[PDB]
């Protein structure tokens, strides 16, 4: 279950929507600032309830 | 070692050549030289406006060296499969080859495949 | 009066159903000098006009060489022209180097249009501001193509773009019924006569402000400039 | 992040103006110690005698600080200070100098006024501490990232009058802890009717080669204010 | 009576934080009381109709074996914060091989909340949390605002009519209060200004002890309501 | 919708998105095109305006060939229509490669409609400004006709019309009995409707473009032969 | 031929890894804590300037650590040096520790540089 | 600029007007849906409108099959509803792949609500103007009815409604539920509620009915003959 | 290692009524988070899948009945 499988099953629109959502959420990013927590990014990616 | 690399040398079309591959989490570094030095430096990245994001098109940019269409064509046809098989990751290529031809490219692709680290 | 809020970005629709930035970009083609393109049964010819300033300050490359069977002429933004020329050269070279066969002109023009359509829909980008005339020869014969900043392309029997090209267009429309049976000399004469219509009533064509590009059967794309245009210029009549 | 046509930073000016409406803090340096005095703007009977907006934080065993501004930003900055001090101690096997700590925090404060698209921290600090290089010290900070050493200073509400009275009634090289406490009480009473339950007092000193930081009790504050009342009654 | 487009209010505070606090003050009431041995949390769970299913969603949630919390404000923000709190507790347990102290968890949650008050393109959370815990045989009770400023209390209330609840708690609090009396006092505070009939299904009660944190079964709530 | 109509990520106080409405209004300044589904095929018809005599015949086509068995008719912005045609071709090719048989028109319409709808949610892009119809025929499936609009909604139709004069064309189509007719009569009916709904004074001279896919073509989309077009045009002119 | 060397050290509270690739009168150095590559620069010794000529190939233009480190290494070794410094620490004295560790490794194994 | 043109800006009274406008966008469709839970069954009934005579009525529907044992009915914008259905199917497949068993109805509803919550806290994207009602049967709990909204709030119900006339439908259902069901009684109750609220006598081709039963736990869509038989039995 | 009647008789602790014979801490924490989110006792299949992507005898009882993997 990945982007290729999603494209083959549903179509070209689903991975495009997922990547646009990821890019829109990831706009909170800067190098010379303090550490940050990516709450919305983890919620969208689905890994907000598991530990890596 | 945080970074994994492989190297191997042969003789391609009668001239010795050295191939080195090093893998990062954001780039793959491929060195193909016939002079022992890094010559033209080329960067290949997936397009950010690709409609097919599973198999996106590649954009070629020359960072250091001479800018010619042949360089772009050679780099794309040489490392497209390396970019594709690594999970759509960017490739940083340093190539210094005396003469460019399709037979030489096909011969070098096998040597690149042998040194797979991705 | 009400256009202020809707004419600053390319991703904003007007309440009338229009995008004004595309029209503004198309308005930038008329900032360059005029070009004329026409074809016959076996040949395709591009004729261009150089800027009236002195040649010491700058040398202008109005007609460019893309492949052995494709050549283009530009009018608009130099950077956009350079980008498009590099893209076309890379496409043709890749086709030859890989498949050992020439690239069809229709395929090339479709690729150009597809590439140029993208920046008209994204935020923080602007449309290309250049216009192109493409002349080529392939299995289907001679071809003349026109490209627009709005990512639209047309198939033409004869066309003129640039500043004050309406008179050239009118001449081409009037005399278009006899281009097919003409040979190279008469075709170039017709092109020069059409291009002359964009000049004031007293100026005349000179070897220092005329460029010619010719492609056809058993003849690769060639550019004639400076003293090379004398054989074509000789024989022309008074206005 | 944008220069004014006259060469000023509107965001920094707004932050300083906003801080100008916060509580009043005091700092006085003496020959044998240094103290901090603050004003408790909010108070309830149901607080749990810990984490009760205790404005005098403890960074190390040698240093302490006071805050006038946004509480959450203050918490973030104090936590960062604690990690910086611990990291320096682990690296060099030696406590960090107070000026070095202040500079380390001021660099972070200044980066936010130049980079990115985030608003600057609206917090002003007051540092007290002791080190073998210079002894007892007292510094100050502002959102723009500037800092400097002082002998007596005040930040917050009605700070101008407090500074004027401090410069009028302060003498260098002749004041001790008791005189400093009396002057601080007088200045706080003048700049604020004052009650013994509306102030917090902390002191720093050395006890046989060991820094000691203490917070004055309610009974001690009541005794001090009673002594001040007796003195002002005797004056008139 | 006033709308401002600036960052800092004329009183010296952030305008958006004041608006978020105004949003919080319109939520359902919540009450927290710390007794001699344990902490009790209570809230009002009034539903709009009988068509609802009370056994579906809960307002009192446990974070770990010894930590629980309740909210007053917007439900989705509380839901998104609970998962992050649980993840932080699990990470601390994995790293340090010991249960996380209540103060550390409150600090981390407050830092996460504060992170959203400085960046651009986002808005602050519209919730206020009450957190209870038990460490070293000593109960704890904390309250956090939308901006991330937290204080330790002995008895407090938020939501609708929280000033009257605070006055009631001030009038009827004792230093040697027991857990049963604390539960009775919390239920009485909730009953004050309830505009309805209180049953065992429209309120939620949670307690913390030395044995951990747990949510009361509705039968126990009915038994407690029988005494009153 | 003043004050709420500068982005596609904004809601109106009454619950409307005005950028999508402006995009749909952008289709109304294009020449009208119609499509009628018949008993054994689908017939397309486009009223094409001539720009100048310097253009070769057969350029600026508005009837595409998506695949071997799918026909497409567009209206609105030409570049957007060409990009959408490329997307449809890619989807059909991918389905052919994976599942090994020709894609049903329903799935293709759904995929293209979802791709179109994906551009109406974010402020970093703008909605498409074109509408189009798809036609197909099969022995075991019959005739199919679909419509996709800039909002991203797809439906099946018995008779459709898009462009500047879609209302009058729809009123004319409603009087037909296409469920029992054949293609050889539907072509003449389409020509008559196109000639009727054309404005002679506001717009200059035009040319008629016709096509079908059906049983007599064996599931292929082609261009009407010249003689049939001439007969249909003569019938339309003598009826009008 | 081409030689590869790899080593690491612990500075402050982080583990830093160093990767070195040696070519014919050339050098490539990568420094970082995570396997990322976002900076790159090259420096060469020239007779038309007193400071070695250098330029930035990848990354932000506000970071000058890679450029200066490449310039100093090229001056010291008289070679063409590529340097990729990816550490993201705000403290300005951490780069001094990194440079000292690099130097120490240089006299430790002179044949690998 | 303004407290109502920004999704990430609170009003002085602490309100988010973009979410309220998204809620208002649901009524643009003009239809009403009713879901009623029985003793061992769940029934969803929606209203079908096909005004155009040139439109193929077989292509108009609002009942969807998310999983072989989960059904759905959508109210609001058509394209938004279809996108939401596709996202729900993707999430169900991902959950099955990650955990080795089929996703429960409450978990799917929670995941959808969690996804919807993010759209309300970022300014570069807008919420979807649609409402989702899911039905299913749990292994150890029986029939279940769940409902979502653009704000990200979800809950379980015994009976619910969406779209226009939702208040009237809820008022009608409250009295019946308080008074206090077999398979025939649930369908009859839902149809009677819709008919009384709309003040229309229904025809077998004017409504869509989907059911799920403990005996047959697979989602099924009733046919026109079955709907007509139910209508005759009711009348 | 014998599947008895209505149970398994068989010791690292990974979850209630799930036992296997450090990554076990990580899997236990993940299962605890999953159980807290769902509100139900974890299944053996979830532990099996998590261990499979993690990389030995696993045995436990769930709502579906006794289980035993290798």
UniProtKB/Swiss-Prot annotation, chain A:
S-S bonds: none
Record: disease: Keratosis linearis with ichthyosis congenita and sclerosing keratoderma: A keratinizing disorder characterized by ichthyosis, palmoplantar keratoderma with constricting bands around fingers, flexural deformities of fingers and keratotic papules in a linear distribution on the flexural side of large joints. Histological examination of the skin of affected individuals shows hypertrophy and hyperplasia of the spinous, granular and horny epidermal layer.
Part of the full-length chain shown: 62 to 113 of 141
Protein name: Proteasome maturation protein
Its job: Molecular chaperone essential for the assembly of standard proteasomes and immunoproteasomes. Degraded after completion of proteasome maturation. Mediates the association of 20S preproteasome with the endoplasmic reticulum.
Induction statement: By IFNG/IFN-gamma.
Motif (High-affinity association with the preproteasome): 7-11
Compartments, record wording: Cytoplasm, Cytosol; Nucleus; Microsome membrane
UniProt similarity note: Belongs to the POMP/UMP1 family.
Tissue/organ expression: Strongly expressed from the basal layer to the granular layer of healthy epidermis, whereas in KLICK patients there is a gradual decrease of expression toward the granular layer.
Protein's organism: Homo sapiens
Curated annotation (Swiss-Prot), chain D:
InterPro entries per the UniProt record, alphabetical: Ntn_hydrolases_N, Proteasome_alpha, Proteasome_alpha-type, Proteasome_asu_N, Proteasome_bsu_CS, Proteasome_sua/b
Keyword rRNA processing listed: no
Positions of modified residues (Phosphoserine): 4, 66, 164
Positions carrying N6-acetyllysine: 118, 167
Oligomeric and partner information: The 26S proteasome consists of a 20S proteasome core and two 19S regulatory subunits. The 20S proteasome core is a barrel-shaped complex made of 28 subunits that are arranged in four stacked rings. The two outer rings are each formed by seven alpha subunits, and the two inner rings are formed by seven beta subunits. The proteolytic activity is exerted by three beta-subunits PSMB5, PSMB6 and PSMB7.
Annotated NCBIfam families: PRK03996.1
Entry similarity comment: Belongs to the peptidase T1A family.
Protein name: Proteasome subunit alpha type-4
Organism this protein belongs to: Homo sapiens
Source taxonomy: Eukaryota, Metazoa, Chordata, Craniata, Vertebrata
Swiss-Prot record, chain F:
UniProt KW Acetylation keyword: yes
Keyword ATP-binding: no
Modification Phosphoserine occurs at: 239
A single GO BP: proteasome-mediated ubiquitin-dependent protein catabolic process
GO cellular component terms, semicolon-separated: cytoplasm; cytosol; extracellular exosome; nucleoplasm; nucleus; proteasome complex; proteasome core complex; proteasome core complex, alpha-subunit complex
Induction cue: Down-regulated by antioxidants BO-653 and probucol. Up-regulated by bacterial lipopolysaccharides (LPS) and TNF.
Localization per record: Cytoplasm; Nucleus
Modified residues (N6-acetyllysine): 53, 202, 226
Example GO molecular function: ubiquitin protein ligase binding
Keywords from the UniProt entry: Acetylation, Cytoplasm, Host-virus interaction, Nucleus, Phosphoprotein, Proteasome
Entry similarity comment: Belongs to the peptidase T1A family.
Entry function: Component of the 20S core proteasome complex involved in the proteolytic degradation of most intracellular proteins. This complex plays numerous essential roles within the cell by associating with different regulatory particles. Associated with two 19S regulatory particles, forms the 26S proteasome and thus participates in the ATP-dependent degradation of ubiquitinated proteins.
Protein name (record): Proteasome subunit alpha type-3
Organism: Homo sapiens (Human)
Origin organism lineage: Eukaryota, Metazoa, Chordata, Craniata, Vertebrata
UniProtKB/Swiss-Prot annotation, chain I:
Subunit structure: The 26S proteasome consists of a 20S proteasome core and two 19S regulatory subunits. The 20S proteasome core is a barrel-shaped complex made of 28 subunits that are arranged in four stacked rings. The two outer rings are each formed by seven alpha subunits, and the two inner rings are formed by seven beta subunits. The proteolytic activity is exerted by three beta-subunits PSMB5, PSMB6 and PSMB7. (Microbial infection) Interacts with HIV-1 Tat protein.
Portion of the full-length sequence here: 48 to 155 of 277
Superkingdom of the organism of origin: Eukaryota
Tissue spec: Expressed at a low level in colonic mucosa. Up-regulated in colorectal cancer tissues.
Any Gene Ontology CC annotation: nuclear body
Family membership noted in the UniProt record: Belongs to the peptidase T1B family.
GO biological process: proteasome-mediated ubiquitin-dependent protein catabolic process
Annotated keywords: Cytoplasm, Host-virus interaction, Hydrolase, Nucleus, Protease, Proteasome, Threonine protease, Zymogen
Compartmental location: Cytoplasm; Nucleus
Functional summary from the UniProt entry: Component of the 20S core proteasome complex involved in the proteolytic degradation of most intracellular proteins. This complex plays numerous essential roles within the cell by associating with different regulatory particles. Associated with two 19S regulatory particles, forms the 26S proteasome and thus participates in the ATP-dependent degradation of ubiquitinated proteins.
GO MF: endopeptidase activity; threonine-type endopeptidase activity
